[model samples]
Target: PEMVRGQVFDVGPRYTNLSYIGEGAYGMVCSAYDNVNKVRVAIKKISPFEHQTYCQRTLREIKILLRFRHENIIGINDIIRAPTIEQMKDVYIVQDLMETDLYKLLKTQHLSNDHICYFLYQILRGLKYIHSANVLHRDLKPSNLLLNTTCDLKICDFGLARVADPATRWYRAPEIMLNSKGYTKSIDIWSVGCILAEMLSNRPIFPGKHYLDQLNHILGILGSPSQEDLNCIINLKARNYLLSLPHKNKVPWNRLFPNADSKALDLLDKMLTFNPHKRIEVEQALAHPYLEQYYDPSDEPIAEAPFKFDMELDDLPKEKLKELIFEETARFQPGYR
Candidate 1:
């Protein structure tokens, strides 16, 4: 095989990397073809030697993907570790290849209301499944959403995810912004709100320059947090800073999106609520009249328990990490062994 001959730590005889796709959590992603399966796939090539920090996250990502099996979640076909001891520096994760991501699609094409509704439906469907499993996709920006020509979407990139961490600044929830430790799955719904608003306007709704600015942008649009909401903030410094800002009244949704359908706007309003407790949950968002016809309880699979990774891998040496990867791969696909 060309890969083995070239001493590449990527594909072996079963796959071939065709081109670079984009950067992922730990390394460069490439579009490849699975020869045995006769299908295209995406491979994430990661170099463990690059950084010690990458080891734990890489192992965590691998374990998480192994348990995820849903239409709206990117499916992993295989994970190929270094074929030889000499090539042990890099590892490859092969998965279903998508045509493009939502961030790129939104830049080049205008989305209709139907497209928006269907896309949001898929996002909630995926989130509903993930939340029910007691997992949180701490990162839910546009780039994390993969798409096909048929307008289907799959949520990707679990590198920075944890059940408890906050999302990225622009789409982060108020509770996260306030450094609340007890944030819930509603944080993801808040990101969904930002994504929906961006799909219609073709620009980030709250494009903040920094973390502090992000809170200002959110407050400017949604107004100050209620007394009950403010009381929920456990971080002393965060609670004080919020109290220092001038009082702001809630902005009318009609003013922000005058052309969007009233029903769609109503759902968006609920999603962007200031209080995490009041934020629209995935089930409620999916049931909203905007996506009435799309709703099918049977279509929504019951969420499962969150995957638990081997904590021992967290501090393992590079060679041990490599061994663990192979062990995991074998466990994931017994047929391969």
Candidate 2:
């Protein structure tokens, strides 16, 4: 309810008056007009020095954006920092400002099957590239999906914990709740599947009331895991708790989504599978019949090489990260018209 703490966050003369939009756990966000370019931009001012953790996250996102480019993915126009090191305390992120995000859009309006299909395809297409680079959008959800007026979508927040979204876990795949550390891109696939289902259902498919309830919501729809499926859970307590529950029957796809097409349901089923191994891969998902219309290998390119991780990130000092973020901004500074 209060104003964004960093409402005073500044940018260059190019960006005019700021109108605060939303504030997340990290920093303050506002929409600004790029006077010279004659376009609107969202500038998020973050104080990375508050925590070493924030610095690492800021640097990682900048690196990922630097290496990434795709129409469906959120576009990063540039990064701006204070002219002086002392001013660099607040790192400003300049990127496209969508009118709204998928989460808000979904709640207010209903989408046709065609609308759902195209949105899912774009997400898949964008993800195809991200996974190619071996990157996982650990937090993929409708809210993180930035959608423009014409329905153009870009994946973002790639969290200031200033105000975290509880629904994040609602998108969590079954394996993740088991407390298992064996993570992979499959988790992202699972999240998108939930998004697909939500687009169809007009509400969260698994609005888990609590951690255990979350699993129950999933089990109710997917049916109890076969004994073998439980083996995948490395957490003994978690696995046994699942076993203790009475068996559940998988809900019929048509029953769950009355108007959804068979193909869409089929694809959703594969993505939300109990066994992480059986879940659909991003490459294969884009090829599914449900998205065949939009699948174009020619333009849906893949990353040439995996996104290399800067191992020293965890050990790097806060000041070092600040300079690194500054350096990252210059990569896009040369050509801003």
Candidate 3:
């Protein structure tokens, strides 16, 4: 915890001034100066493996970040670890630093339609890459979206993200609320819809107080799901409860966003569809006319080969966890001294 003039004290090399930024589920984030790159960067430090799950999630995060290389996805610079097993107590993940996040941007700035379209475009482009690699963001909210003054966006905060609460219930998908198994990438599109709605209206379209309230808000605006949609619900009890709710027809797109262009509204409708299967895929969403003008295939991230990560490490013993971490660090950041 030493404060040095130009180095990350007792942490790593050529990084300086590890100032605290914020706290995450299992770690704290700090900002530092990358002397090698001559720029600022962010660092997340995970907790010591007091429990098995903590170590597993930390490894998973590092694996995903190291595997992903996209402009729209936050980049990982290095993984700083103890030189010896006896000295291992914390792991520091270094990453690109952004000026602000979408949550704060939306709160403070009045975004033009151009801003919304481009922002959502980059998000889908990032999603396209992520889905191509068979990784689920699991957590997609404004706060997880890192952005800069130039309107650049990068999707961050994976690894420890879950399919459960504290995930901003208002942005959660219906299938998640129903506790459905086998949910797909479209779950992310649902959250994208909520984000789009927020960007357009400058407020959360469904600011529900809780679970039931969340459903009620969606149902109230979009109306109860159709019978076919209800069939998609895996939980019988949830489907039944949904059926019992009084029928309410969906609000017309124009009414919801009178100022929004038809093309934008059209895509928003497709993205917010109640059924996950029917929701727009990342590719199609990117191709929508709303984003067509901004679309450039070159903007999409390309990977030389597919990447995969194993998440079944929750039950691994602490020693095994340590070994796995070392293994991944070698693969991701070889030649670390």
Candidate 4:
């Protein structure tokens, strides 16, 4: 009995398990039938908080998703657990069961320029709303981004939710790797640029094996940063070393992305700018002509105020973490002790 775990995924009667879906380090996922709604949903089951990583990340997402409501952002349909803590060793995150995620679709489908345009529009719209609340995704990759057959998109995960084997460095921005004490929403933009290019070419444009290699891959295309562009780097040595590195010419857009829309490349140029201060913002990116087909200023929304969240969790006790975790579900429901 000491080694055996308690009952898991014993969510109450309304939902029926359909099939075992994919999973991650935290736990498993299964497609379930919403008997009352008569629709399919994805239920992600998580392991206990005994592992500190699971305790912190699960709580962070619950807190973030509780307040976030947008068409392109993953919304929690429902949350369920046992009445007592002993019977609640696991947590289930319920969401719409989409056709597939962006990562899997990128390889399986032959999406057109039009498809990429629509996808880009939705990403920026979501980012605009996300950044307005002063909450950066921290990690934005193709896999974490969700999609449906209708071509609609939604971003999954938040500060810590992730799948196995995350290739994060490929989508990182300059200021992050170049050494900056402060980071901002601009990091998300750089990732969007990488995702945009990947969707265009159907492969990772910057497939860097290591951080240095990632910088080199980016530099090989971006060319050398001028003194002005290099001004933002806080560390003088790293800044000068970058300038001292073999001078490389900025590869022409056409050669890099053949048969691509000029407008797409134009937007990509601004998104990939080495200077974080100079990089395009979500609002401005949405305004660019490349997304003219799906452009609608009125539809894009932003949160009313900055998210008031507590980031530190290092010294938090297990009991405190459990209370907050259950407290999130109570927000969707009511009357809990």
* TM-score against native, each model: 0.89, 0.88, 0.88, 0.89
C-alpha lDDT of all candidate models, in order: 0.79, 0.81, 0.80, 0.80
RMSD of candidate 3 to the truth, in angstroms, is: 3.7
lDDT of 1 by residue, 86-194 (tens): 6566677888998899989999988899999999999999988888777787779998899987888999887655654333478887777687577678888999999
Q: Per-residue lDDT of 99-218 in model 4, one digit per residue for the tens?
A: 777788888976799989999999999989888888878778888888888888999877453211113689888777887457778888999999998888888888899988999999
* Residues forming the 10-long window of minimal summed lDDT in candidate 1: 1-10
TM-score, predicted candidate 3 vs. hidden true structure: 0.88
Rank by lDDT (best first): 2, 4, 3, 1
For model 4, the run of ten residues with the poorest summed lDDT: 159-168
In terms of lDDT, the poorest run of 10 residues in model 2 is: 159-168
lDDT by residue (tens digit), candidate 2, 135-186: 8877788888888888778888773111111135899888888855677788
lDDT of residue 5 for candidate 2: 47
Candidate 2 vs candidate 3: which has greater lDDT? 2
What RMSD, rounded to one decimal, does every model reach?
3.3, 4.5, 3.7, 4.4
**Where does candidate 1 stray beyond 4 Å?**
1-9, 49-52, 83-87, 163-168, 304-306, 310-326, 332-337
Model 3 lDDT tens row, 1-337: 5453332345556777788776656767778888888989988777657778777677777777877788899988877777666667778888888888888888898789988998999898888888777667877888888998787999988875433222468888888888657768888899898999888888888899998989999988888788789888888998888878898988887897899878888999999999888999888888888998788877676666656554466577978888788777764354655
Which residues of candidate 4, in runs, are more than 4 Å off?
1-8, 25-27, 161-167, 240-244, 314-319, 331-337
Angstrom error of the Cα, residue 202, model 4: value is: 0.2
